[PDB]
Design a protein around this nucleic acid. Structure first.
Ligand SMILES: [Mg+2]
Ligand SMILES: [Mg+2]
Ligand SMILES: [Mg+2]
Ligand SMILES: [Mg+2]
Ligand SMILES: [Mg+2]
Ligand SMILES: [Mg+2]
Ligand SMILES: [Mg+2]
Ligand SMILES: [Mg+2]
Ligand SMILES: [Mg+2]
Ligand SMILES: [Mg+2]
Ligand SMILES: [Mg+2]
Ligand SMILES: [Mg+2]
Ligand SMILES: [Mg+2]
Ligand SMILES: [Mg+2]
Ligand SMILES: [Mg+2]
Ligand SMILES: [Mg+2]
Ligand SMILES: [Mg+2]
Ligand SMILES: [Mg+2]
Ligand SMILES: [Mg+2]
Ligand SMILES: [Mg+2]
Ligand SMILES: [Mg+2]
Ligand SMILES: [Mg+2]
Ligand SMILES: [Mg+2]
Ligand SMILES: [Mg+2]
Ligand SMILES: [Mg+2]
Ligand SMILES: [Mg+2]
Ligand SMILES: [Mg+2]
Ligand SMILES: [Mg+2]
Ligand SMILES: [Mg+2]
Ligand SMILES: [Mg+2]
Ligand SMILES: [Mg+2]
Ligand SMILES: [Mg+2]
Ligand SMILES: [Zn+2]
Ligand SMILES: [Zn+2]
Lengths: 126, 136, 192, 79, 49, 48
RNA sequence: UUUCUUGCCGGAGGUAGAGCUACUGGAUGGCCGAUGGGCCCCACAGGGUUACUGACGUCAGCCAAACUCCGAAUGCCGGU
RNA sequence: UUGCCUCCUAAAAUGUAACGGAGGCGCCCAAAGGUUCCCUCAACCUGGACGGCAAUCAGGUGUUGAGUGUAAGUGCACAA
RNA sequence: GUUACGGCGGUCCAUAGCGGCAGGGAAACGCCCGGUCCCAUCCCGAACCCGGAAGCUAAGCCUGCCAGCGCCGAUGAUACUACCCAUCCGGGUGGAAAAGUAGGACACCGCCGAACAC
């Protein structure tokens, strides 16, 4: 036995991320016609869901664990743009072109910005 | 005399003096007690007189618990004055007593002396009380 | 040391309320409720006189044998709602119990004997909680005072506890404290 | 011989103005209050002095949402 | 006064559009802010009179 | 790592008096130090 | 008939009562025992002894128009 | 004493009187206004030269007891 | 469809919490390694941001079991109360608490994705 005493950086990252997410969520939400594009991000993968908060359901989703996205030899920005175009295509198939961006409690930029601008050019107006 | 060190408000309304004592109706500290039967305002004058009465009667060794505190002030406007010009200045202190509340409690070896000291105290109070024992 | 249960009669309350309870209390009857693991809160009138008699004979904590319309049940007094003034018992609570059943209870502690003369013995906690079987419940247990030395405290952990019974209270709960008898120049110095 | 008090302010007539199940117009103010004793609910907005008003026609109904008393406007069906 | 009433006038048309207050002890110089001019039609600097 | 606000920091060569050579980095604009009492000199450090 | 009454339904309260280890204050008696009190060996180090005063805490019983973890009956708003 | 604001009286909607019980106001801030993003205090224990309970540093416990220009009340840690 | 999975939510937001004991690392979730580049510290690549896959279940996460603390909580009685009787006392019919007891509870529900026979 070796009882640890401190708090781990995982806890502070996770719950501070959740607090930022909730503060954000106080002001955006998803309908059927203008759903919410929520994003997760880790050291390996980036995830997106298209949510109708009236139900708590998901309309479309994507991540960087699909076959094609793992088929890219490029950079994390390349995976981000691939996910963005894929989720834009899936949303357009589902019958929607307007959305609100839930950045997920991460600062807007880097790969999240790349994803968001890929979806922007791909057909989703936000 | 028993006087609170400070009260948040020094001019309150008269304590509502209705109902039966719900809290503080059992003898717990000593073995014999004086337990009330009528609503009243037991001032610190009454309490001091009753306590000195008990101490004079037993006079040897035994514990007297005054488990009521006079901490509610009754005011009185100065004499010869008409009505109006606001409420008076507080000048005596009171415990609000309901029928049921044990007022004084005593611990002493024997029986008759304890009973007699308790009734000596009772005679100094503005109410009817009765001597109650530690058992049902 | 099994205690023989006491045999009362009871009968189901037809209708409930403060009016019904007042009327029943007026006819020399006590309203009461059975519960426990019998999982049926059953509303029972019982004889007030016999209830008081058995509570006198065997304290607050005593097993009863209730005859509910012919059915035979074992009960144990859980609580008694008593008027502060008229002192009549108003209501009773009856856990259902059976043999070989541990149950938590509160037992009065009555100091026995005389103490050393220069000081007075005074109890702070008159009741001590014990875990014990339904039949083996002591109605009262004693604490020893026989010429103690100068003022000292007594706690539940050093009491001669009966057999088959277990202390529940934390052992460091004071029960009886011998405190030096106030002198002539010490008794009237406190209280003002 | 004088009282050093004897001043008070006007009553502001605060309180709930529309109760549960009450049909309102869009824009009706529903509860006047000081702080946020009732928090804005679905399709209910909050004014500058913390006055709750209805952002859509419907029926008033109260609720609790994560330990917060809230007021909501429910769309009644068009006959 | 220490917080007197002041007026703000557009520079490009000299029309007095707004009246406000400010502290002379803390803002000794003329206060200037970009306000909205109804006849200039757009936001213009406005300077204390 | 800001642009230029921090004080100058470069690698430095530190030589002991008793012959120890320390390969370090400091804010010394020169980058060269010699010290006569070091980790092998004090009686408390090496028991002498 | 929009009025009023009665039944049912949808509401928001903080009164009576109660409780307080749920807050703000008052307030009874115990228990351990500080810090700060005195003394010894002897230093104003350090240690322990002593009616010490006895922070905090804790056990049990309480109190409040401007206290509330709670909390009715009625009344009130609407519908039916 | 006379206008305004807050509380209790005021009897759980609103309103409610007395030379009833308590206090504030006649301002302040060009940021103490707008928006965007980020953070969580007070207190307590432990470890530190000045530095003492107390000043700044580090570790922990800490869900609100701190703070909110300004009385009081309603609020606010989702943060106001 | 199976999952000692990962997200996004809901519930008059603790019956869900705190604590304790015992497990796991498929993909995932993490920690971890570095600061070349976007970006960052009122100093610090600790945080945030960008790149990587050497090591890990020690945490975070999730799973199972404990009722020790916190939480929930009846039935009955009682307090209080509307209306009505009633020459003060008091009573009847309806409503009915707080505290306490019996007990409950180590949450439940939903929608997407991951791996897996498909
Ligand atoms: Mg650490
Ligand atoms: Mg009253
Ligand atoms: Mg009582
Ligand atoms: Mg009480
Ligand atoms: Mg008398
Ligand atoms: Mg007012
Ligand atoms: Mg505003
Ligand atoms: Mg305004
Ligand atoms: Mg300035
Ligand atoms: Mg009707
Ligand atoms: Mg109703
Ligand atoms: Mg209600
Ligand atoms: Mg109130
Ligand atoms: Mg009361
Ligand atoms: Mg007070
Ligand atoms: Mg009250
Ligand atoms: Mg009112
Ligand atoms: Mg009223
Ligand atoms: Mg009037
Ligand atoms: Mg004045
Ligand atoms: Mg501000
Ligand atoms: Mg600003
Ligand atoms: Mg700290
Ligand atoms: Mg819990
Ligand atoms: Mg793995
Ligand atoms: Mg790096
Ligand atoms: Mg583990
Ligand atoms: Mg984990
Ligand atoms: Mg609770
Ligand atoms: Mg009930
Ligand atoms: Mg009469
Ligand atoms: Mg209860
Ligand atoms: Zn102009
Ligand atoms: Zn050297």
């Amino acid at each position: 036995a070796h009882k640890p005493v401190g708090q781990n950086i995982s806890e502070v990252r996770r719950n501070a991320r959740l607090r930022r997410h909730a503060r954000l969520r106080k002001k955006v939400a998803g309908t059927a016609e203008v759903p919410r594009l929520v994003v997760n991000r880790s050291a390996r993968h980036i995830h997106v869901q298209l949510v109708n908060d009236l139900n708590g359901t998901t309309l479309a989703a994507a991540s960087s664990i699909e076959a094609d996205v793992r088929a890219i030899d490029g950079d994390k920005k390349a995976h981000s743009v691939r996910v963005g175009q894929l989720i834009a295509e899936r949303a357009k198939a589902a019958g929607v072109e307007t959305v609100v961006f839930d950045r997920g409690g991460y600062t807007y930029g880097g790969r999240i910005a790349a994803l968001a601008d890929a979806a922007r050019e791909a057909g989703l107006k936000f | 005399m028993l006087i609170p060190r400070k009260v948040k408000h020094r001019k309150q309304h008269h304590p509502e003096q209705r109902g039966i004592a719900s809290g503080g109706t059992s003898v717990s500290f000593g073995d014999y007690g004086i337990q009330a039967l009528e609503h009243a305002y037991i001032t610190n004058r009454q309490i001091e007189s009753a306590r000195i009465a008990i101490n004079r009667h037993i006079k040897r060794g035994g514990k007297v618990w005054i488990n009521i505190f006079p901490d509610r002030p009754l005011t009185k406007k100065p004499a010869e004055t008409r009505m109006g010009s606001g409420k008076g200045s507080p000048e005596w202190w009171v415990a609000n007593v309901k029928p049921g509340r044990v007022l004084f409690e005593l611990s002493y070896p024997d029986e008759k002396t304890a009973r007699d000291a308790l009734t000596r105290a009772i005679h100094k109070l503005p109410i009817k009380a009765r001597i109650v024992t530690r058992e049902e | 040391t099994a205690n023989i249960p006491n045999k009362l009669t009871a009968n189901v309350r037809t209708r409930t309320g403060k009016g019904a309870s007042r009327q029943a209390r007026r006819d020399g009857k006590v309203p009461a409720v059975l519960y426990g693991h019998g999982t049926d809160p059953q509303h029972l009138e019982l004889n007030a006189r016999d209830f008081a008699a058995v509570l006198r004979s065997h304290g607050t904590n005593a097993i009863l044998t209730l005859d509910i319309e012919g059915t035979e049940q074992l009960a144990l007094t859980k609580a008694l709602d008593v008027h502060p003034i008229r002192r009549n018992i108003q209501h009773a609570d009856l856990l259902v119990v059976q043999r070989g059943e541990k149950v938590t209870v509160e037992v009065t502690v009555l100091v026995e004997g005389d103490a050393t003369p220069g000081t007075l013995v005074t109890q702070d906690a008159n009741t001590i909680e014990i875990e014990a079987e339904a039949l083996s419940i002591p109605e009262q247990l004693t604490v020893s005072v026989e010429g103690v030395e100068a003022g000292t405290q007594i706690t539940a952990g050093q009491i001669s506890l009966p057999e088959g019974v277990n202390l529940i209270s934390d052992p460091e709960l004071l029960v009886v404290n011998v405190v030096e008898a106030p002198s002539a120049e010490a008794l009237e110095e406190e209280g003002a | 011989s004088s009282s050093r008090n004897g001043r008070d302010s006007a009553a502001q007539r605060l309180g709930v103005k529309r109760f549960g199940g009450q049909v309102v117009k869009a824009g009706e103010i529903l509860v006047r209050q000081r702080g946020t004793h009732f928090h804005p609910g679905v399709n209910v907005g909050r004014g500058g002095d913390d006055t709750l008003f209805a952002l859509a026609p419907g029926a008033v109904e109260f609720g609790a949402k994560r330990g917060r008393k809230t007021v909501n406007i429910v769309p009644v069906a068009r006959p | 006064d220490v917080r007197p009433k002041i007026t703000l006038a557009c520079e490009v048309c000299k029309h007095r559009n707004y009246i406000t207050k400010k502290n002379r002890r803390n803002d000794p110089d003329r206060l200037e802010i970009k306000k909205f001019c109804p006849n200039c039609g757009t936001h213009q600097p406005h300077k204390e009179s | 790592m800001k642009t230029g606000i921090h004080p100058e920091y470069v690698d430095t060569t530190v030589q002991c008096g008793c012959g120890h050579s320390f390969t370090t980095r400091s804010t010394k604009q020169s980058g060269t130090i010699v010290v006569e009492v070091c980790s092998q000199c004090h009686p408390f450090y090496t028991g002498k």
